[PDB]
Amino acid sequence: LFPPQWICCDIRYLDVSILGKFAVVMADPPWDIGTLTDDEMRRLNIPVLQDDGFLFLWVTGRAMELGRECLNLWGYERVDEIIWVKTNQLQRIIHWLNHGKEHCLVGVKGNPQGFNQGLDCDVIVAEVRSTSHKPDEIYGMIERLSPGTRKIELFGRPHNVQPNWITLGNQLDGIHLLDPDVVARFKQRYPDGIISK
């Protein structure tokens, strides 16, 4: 379990029922603002991934509205909104206005218990790395919120892989699965080891 696991794949086509239930889902989707259409986004099978937990959903532009929509369709209530203030290595800030921040919606589903609500604040301050590259502070925040629990990231890239996290994304390097029950349900669902349509 504990060490980073991942799956290179098209998240549209993967049968995420094999992966089980997670205390936290994080998604950083390629909103159409290799992107996904709004219907493709609305159709993702997020609802099977959780019973009681949180969803972290990166948004920008009109995805700010659309992400709220997917968030509610998938069965979550938006209860927080993190913003990451973008700085350089000297802690200064990098249509109508220039943008100094990225938004991440926080959704709750069910009734999660045993989480440490209230340890971090809803503002992150941290340096920009690659274009499209998220700050590692979010993993620290998510760890303090729900420590030791299983977490899944959608549309992550290789640098995003983390302990306790299963990463899905089409630019990862193949498949790397260590959780036995997940290896089991994977082999049952994908015996010849391919995932299309």
Binding site: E81, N98, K101, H103, D122, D136
Partner: protein, 236 residues
Amino acid sequence: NDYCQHFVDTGHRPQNFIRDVIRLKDELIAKSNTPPMYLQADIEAFDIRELTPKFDVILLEPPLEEYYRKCWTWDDIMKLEIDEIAAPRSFIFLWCGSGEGLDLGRVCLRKWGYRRCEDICWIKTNKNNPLDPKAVFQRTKEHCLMGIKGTVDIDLIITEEPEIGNIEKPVEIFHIIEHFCLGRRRLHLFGRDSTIRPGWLTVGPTLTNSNYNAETYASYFSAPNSYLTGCTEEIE
């Protein structure tokens, strides 16, 4: 340097460590500003239609229950007929707090006929001072959503957490609006005596004096001043 870890350790919000917080344009705005006008009105009980003309900019600062730790619920706000006093091409700036208003205020914008184009965040430092039940994190910001209908600055305002019970929003919001140069008929709903400001009509229940006259107000925008940006010369 993990500023979130640091905040968990010390009580210092990450924004505490952001460093570092054109003139002639301010002069041009200040020159073309109408005299401040203001009217005491109980907005729930007041037909907003007798505020004329239609406005180019609306700054809407309803008193949210969450600001206190007469309040207006989003139920009340959503029933305001904002679309009846907005110019066909106009802009709205709506303070939504940090809770459900982030969603309900977006409903309002669409209800009144606007689409969101900016999400301006007021980030509140606690350098001088190291919970909603639904909350997952400590809330250290408020959002002011910007709307457009029809056809320099950044989207962050950083200041210290005001004293408890102080509901004032940072005056920087006004600079941001005015630097957009969106027109001269500017309305601030639920302003206060403390927010009255040249270039602005203020309507709100706690104002102590009124000077508003609909004809005097319309005076300021008659030809040849009908379509000014507020960022240009006075027409001699």
